[PDB]
Structures are given as structure tokens and as C-alpha cells.
A paper describes a structure:
β-Propeller proteins are common natural disc-like pseudo-symmetric proteins that contain multiple repeats (‘blades’) each consisting of a 4-stranded anti-parallel β-sheet. In the larger propellers a so-called “Velcro closure” is found, in which the N- and C-terminal β-strands are part of the same β-sheet, keeping the propeller closed.
While the space group and packing differ between the crystals, the structure is identical for each protein. Analysing the thermal and chemical stability of the [name]-T permutants revealed that nvWRAP-T, lacking the velcro closure, is just as stable as the variant v13WRAP-T. While [name] is considerably more resistant to GdnHCl induced denaturation compared to the other proteins, its increased thermal stability is not that significant. Just as with [name]-T, the inside “Velcro3-1” position is highly resistant to chemical denaturation. However, these two examples alone may not be sufficient to determine a clear correlation, and additional proteins will be needed to confirm whether the inner “Velcro” is consistently the most stable conformation for propeller proteins.
Residue numbers in the entry: 1 to 286
The structure:
Amino acid sequence: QTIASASDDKTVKLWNRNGQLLQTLTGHSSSVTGVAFSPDGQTIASASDDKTVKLWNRNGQLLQTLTGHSSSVTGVAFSPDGQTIASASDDKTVKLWNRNGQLLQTLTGHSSSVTGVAFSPDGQTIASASDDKTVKLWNRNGQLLQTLTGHSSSVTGVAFSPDGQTIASASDDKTVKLWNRNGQLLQTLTGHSSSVTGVAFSPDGQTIASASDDKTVKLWNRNGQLLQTLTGHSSSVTGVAFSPDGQTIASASDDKTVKLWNRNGQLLQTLTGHSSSVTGVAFSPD
């Protein structure tokens, strides 16, 4: 029932499905690059080029600042149990933190910026995307488990399926790739005409959504067959998310809006109010 949007205007905004602006989270000193909700939906985390993650409540109160990366933070995620936060950074690391802001681990191994991060559904694997053209899988002790190789250019985003067996990656090489947890390449999804900027799984695991600089969202089945292309944004699409009931898709764009869509490609709502590019979007667990 609540949508969060991240923006180059240095804020997060919270909205309802009817299009009302509920709250603006103000306090980062540079662009906000991604956003996530805790599993209980009551805490929001934001990632920023000001090199921090910030934690907020729905009244807009700043609750905590996570300081420790040496360059921009590019993405943030909560573990399924809510106890651990993961952050991705241009400083080439992922950091793991507890909810009070203390650093637990630094995951070292990528050779270029880390662009996104995700947890497996069982909470036991972390996946990271990088400009070094790989996804890496790690445990919560920081040990490297696998390196997923095969993209020809930067990897911009990564997602787990709800059943924790399949990984999806998005890339500047204009494809999404699907993988197993052993690092094997299963499928390449081709069809976008420019960089793919983000990827997500539907909650039933049957559908993949991709966002692209080609101004569209595309929806795909598990065999990599293109189902549907969502057209309407007027500038690059920078991220995509599914609602928990899987009946709504949200897209973020450099055209400064979020758009909400249903499963048949109809446009439901356009959320207007950010003064710069929208860089990411998330749904609360309800």
C-alpha cells in the first residue's frame, strides 16, 4: 500500500496507491540512489552519493546514519529477518550493518564500483552487481562463494527469485541474464535497445521485469520469452519493482516520475513531485 521513490533531488518520497504524496524524507546532502523498506514496513533505508545510508520512519524522522563507505552508496537492502542491512558502493565493497548502524562486515573482491545488492529469501546469501562485469555471491561472514561471469559490460542491478534458486542480473550490454546459485548461466534475455538499469522478480517467481535506458519496462517469463513492453516514460527508466500481491508494477525514470502499472500493461498512476531524476523505487511489504 506504500511506494517509496529515490531521487537526484536528494529526497525520498512516500506515496499511496491512489497517488497521494504522504511524506518527503529530507536530510541527505547529495543524490539518493536507492531505497528499501524493512520487512515490517515501518523503517525506510535510503542510499546516497553523500556516502551514507540513512534510516527513517514514516513520520519523516531521521533515525540513524550508517557511515563507513569511502565513496557513493549505490543501493541498499534489508535481510528477510530484518536484522541486517546491506549497502553497495562505488568504493568497490558491500558493507553489512545491524539496525543500530554498527558495521558487521566488509565484502571485498569486486574490481570496480558495486552498483546494487540483494539478499536471498533464506537470508543466507548476498548478491552484488558490479561495473567489473560480474555478480558475486557471498555469505554473511563476508566469504566469497561464487562469481557469475558472462555479461559483456557493467552489471547495473541484481535480484533473487522468491524461491532462492534463480538470480537475475541487468547490464549495460542490453541484456538480463538468469543464473543458478552455482554460477551457471541459464538464459540471456534480449530485446532492449539500450542499457538495462534494473531487474526484479514477481512474488510468484513466474515473471521478470527489466528497466532500461530505452525508456521501457519489459516483462518476461522464466524461459526468457518477452511477454509485454510498458511504454509511457519519456526518458530512461532507472528501476522497477513489483508489489507484494504481484498485481502492480512500479517504474522509476529520469523523466522525474514513478509510474504504476497493472499486470496487463495498463497505466494506473503517474507520481509527480520530484524535481530531478527518480533513481529507484520500492513497495512496502503490505
